[PDB]
Specification:
By secondary structure, the protein is α/β, with parallel strands linked by helices. It folds into two domains: 151 residues, no CATH class; 120 residues, no CATH class. The protein has nine helices and eight strands. The strands form two sheets. The chain has a four-stranded parallel β-sheet with strand order 2-1-3-4, covered by helices on one side. β5, α6 and β6 form a beta-alpha-beta unit. The longest helix has 23 residues. The radius of gyration is 20 Å and the shape is globular. Bound molecules: fe (ii) ion. Fe (ii) ion (FE2) binds next to loops.
């Protein structure tokens, strides 16, 4: 029987939906911890010794896992690189591939394929379940985009605190004008925040996508100084691990974006 290690919350959703009850899904770090903050611990490193495989993002969102494997009782534990077939943006790679439907479909497939070689007695079911999960994801996207009447206007500029939504917004045909955090998971300095606030003003940035999971203080200040409309998105990293979390949280993100586009594209009449 298979014991599969996962690093982030969406990967628990991918692996749980591929295996069903044919394997155990084992989170590497505890639920409740912020994966950006998490500093490898003794008990967590010992757990790797109980695993057979570890499913990694490996593009910059689980470096802690690559480190905790090297100090484990299994330094040469079979590793699955979930983003092996995923086209990335932009040495500076955005690791938030999991906050995109098409990028998730490629990761689910890569995972089910590689798990199939490790457990050949269940490769049939893993392929079978990956097609089932993908269908639920394609429809999730389809329904969100079916609620969008008009495409955003030429002047529809968007900004985000965390550099996590470049992949999500790509599926709407949108680009992020500005990211408030200078580097991934790095809080800006007051000098940095003043320049960002100055750039959102110069470029007439319409909406700002803040964090639901681990919010920032400086958000009210950005909203105050620039008059930009605030909307919140989920990195899918807070609380409990579950099979449904990814598709649950993701559908909300897709409707927040649909809401943000429609709330700008508000049509009036007469006189
Ligand atoms: Fe992140």
């Amino acid at each position: 029987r298979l014991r599969i290690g996962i690093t982030l919350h969406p990967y628990y959703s991918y692996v749980s939906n591929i295996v069903g009850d044919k394997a155990e899904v084992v989170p590497l770090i505890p639920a409740g911890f912020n994966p950006h903050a998490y500093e490898p611990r003794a008990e967590d490193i010992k757990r790797i010794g109980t695993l057979d495989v570890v499913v990694l993002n490996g593009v910059g969102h689980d470096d802690f896992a690559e480190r905790m494997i090297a100090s484990s009782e299994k330094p040469g534990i079979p590793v699955i690189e979930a983003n092996a077939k995923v086209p990335l943006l932009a040495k500076v790679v955005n690791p938030h591939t999991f906050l995109s439907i098409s990028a998730s479909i490629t990761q689910v497939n890569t995972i089910a394929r590689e798990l199939g070689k490790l457990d050949p007695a269940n490769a049939k079911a893993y392929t079978r379940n990956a097609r089932a999960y993908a269908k639920r994801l394609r429809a999730l996207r389809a329904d969100a985009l079916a609620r969008l009447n008009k495409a955003p206007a030429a002047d529809f500029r968007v900004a985000t605190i965390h550099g996590a939504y470049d992949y999500l917004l790509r599926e709407f045909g949108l680009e992020v004008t500005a990211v408030v955090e200078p580097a991934h998971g790095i809080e800006p300095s007051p000098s940095q925040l003043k320049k960002t606030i100055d750039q959102l003003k110069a470029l007439d940035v319409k909406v700002i996508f803040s964090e639901i999971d681990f919010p920032s203080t400086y958000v009210e200040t950005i909203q105050r100084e620039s008059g930009v409309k605030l909307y919140s998105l989920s990195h899918i990293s807070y609380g409990d691990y579950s099979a449904g979390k990814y598709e649950e949280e993701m559908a909300r993100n897709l409707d927040t974006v649909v809401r943000a586009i429609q709330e700008s594209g508000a049509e009036i009449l007469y006189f």
